[PDB]
């Protein structure tokens, strides 16, 4: 999954 601050 994407890191907490990604996207």
């Amino acid at each position: 999954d994407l890191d907490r601050w990604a996207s």
Epitope: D1, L2, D3, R4, W5, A6
Partner: antibody, heavy 132, light 108 residues
């Protein structure tokens, strides 16, 4: 000034449970978006990421160790605990906890996420040997 | 999972040299990449965060560039304290992977 320090048993026997504590000062795990993670380093080897926990209490674990790790925080004591079950000899390593910044805010408004991309302050590390 | 490959794994150099270490990711990690220097017996120390930002208190000879799948750390004028092992870390995808490390030692 942020400082972290790891504590726990230096020696542990196979199949046993290992509980490591990270006590820190200079920040609160109630501060916005802050994280505290754990990384280990077997002697002579590379760094290996284990887990991290944020102040809003989201938790994430290494997929390879997921079943044996539990990370938890105690905000009022400024501590983060990592519990590893069923250890075996390959778990002998130096274990480090580390701080991760949350986004910069301006008048309590998140404006920069670049500072979250690193673990910026590390504890000295605690050496753990697993042997019967 | 995501793979982070450092090159070279080992590198020899002398005080005053310019060295550059590179780290390649198997999938794009945007700019979420950090570089660390770890001296024997000590914890890793943050040099560069977010691919290119210089961490506060870190000497200016250290520089980081790149985004996506290819990153580089260059130390422009190697000092004695730089003989050490360097690591890159990706923070875009969980788990937050580390590269294999690159050892920088005294050339002879």
């Amino acid at each position: 000034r942020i400082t972290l320090k790891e504590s726990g048993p230096p020696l542990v026997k196979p199949t046993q449970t290992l509980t490591l504590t990270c006590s820190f000062s200079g920040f609160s795990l109630s501060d916005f978006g802050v994280g505290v993670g754990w990384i280990r380093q077997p002697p002579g080897k590379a760094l290996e990421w284990l887990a991290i926990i944020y102040s809003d209490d989201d938790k994430r674990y290494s997929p390879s160790l997921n079943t044996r790790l539990t990370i938890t925080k105690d905000t009022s004591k400024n501590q983060v605990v990592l519990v590893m079950t069923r250890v075996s000899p390959v778990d002998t390593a130096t274990y480090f906890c580390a701080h991760r910044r949350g986004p910069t805010t301006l008048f309590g408004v998140p404006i920069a996420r670049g500072p979250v991309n690193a673990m910026d302050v590390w504890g000295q590390g605690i050496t753990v040997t697993i042997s019967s | 999972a995501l793979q982070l490959t450092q090159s070279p794994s080992s590198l020899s150099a002398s005080v005053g040299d310019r060295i550059t270490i590179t780290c390649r990711a198997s999938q794009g990690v945007t700019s979420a990449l950090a570089w660390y220097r770890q001296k024997p017996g000590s914890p890793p120390q943050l040099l560069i965060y977010d691919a290119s930002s210089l961490e506060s208190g870190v000497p200016s000879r250290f520089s980081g560039s790149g985004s996506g799948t290819e990153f580089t750390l260059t130390i422009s004028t190697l000092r004695p304290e730089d003989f050490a092992t360097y690591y890159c870390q990706q923070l875009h995808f969980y788990p937050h992977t580390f590269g294999g490390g690159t050892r920088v030692d005294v050339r002879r």
